[PDB]
Amino acid sequence: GEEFRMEKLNQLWEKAQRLHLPPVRLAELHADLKIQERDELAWKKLKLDGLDEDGEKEARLIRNLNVILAKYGLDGKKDARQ
């Protein structure tokens, strides 16, 4: 029953669900996050099969999850302390 199968995705997802975003902002975040899940999951398969040795693909996906967050501003708040 986990929206996805990756901890990073399930973590960001649970995070939004925690901030309780409207069905529109959450439907857009969940949808966009899904596409990111299709590529991300596909990535777990990449390393699993041994296709990305330089995690370069993972870096693009990461930078994407990072962009998606920088887009919804849901990047969080502290977590890193400022």
Side-chain angles (χ1 to χ4, degrees):
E2 296 206 45
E3 46 287 322
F4 311 115
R5 313 214 211 165
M6 298 299 271
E7 297 163 79
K8 77 188 84 210
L9 278 132
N10 315 1
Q11 283 242 336
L12 290 156
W13 180 233
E14 274 169 281
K15 240 191 278 273
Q17 282 189 138
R18 240 287 229 317
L19 283 83
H20 273 242
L21 303 72
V24 85
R25 202 170 288 165
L26 198 98
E28 198 85 56
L29 183 88
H30 189 256
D32 291 324
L33 275 178
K34 294 245 279 134
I35 280 63
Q36 204 64 79
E37 175 238 32
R38 284 243 194 165
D39 302 313
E40 282 281 63
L41 281 164
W43 182 88
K44 87 196 254 157
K45 313 218 172 191
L46 273 154
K47 46 159 280 142
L48 271 178
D49 295 317
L51 273 154
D52 191 1
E53 64 198 319
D54 298 322
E56 207 200 283
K57 312 206 65 140
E58 205 198 328
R60 202 192 346 165
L61 274 157
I62 276 148
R63 153 171 266 165
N64 303 131
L65 290 156
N66 272 268
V67 176
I68 280 150
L69 270 300
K71 204 202 224 289
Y72 291 98
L74 221 179
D75 311 49
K77 0 87 269 90
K78 295 300 98 216
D79 255 34
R81 193 249 39 165
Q82 86 316 111

